[PDB]
Amino acid sequence: SNTEELIQNSIGFLQKTFKALPVSFDSIRHEPLPSSMLHASVLNFEWEPL
Description:
By secondary structure, the protein is mostly helical. It contains two helices and no strands. The protein starts with a helix and ends in a 20-residue tail after the last helix.
């Protein structure tokens, strides 16, 4: 497919995912993100545009 289209898909896909997280700005400044707060396919590089 068009690789310009494949990039423009995954910018919108990650923008939907990362805004659904229950993290604030003052909670991720000091404390790191836990590994189990994201899905098991997000951290395995199998995304629905891909």
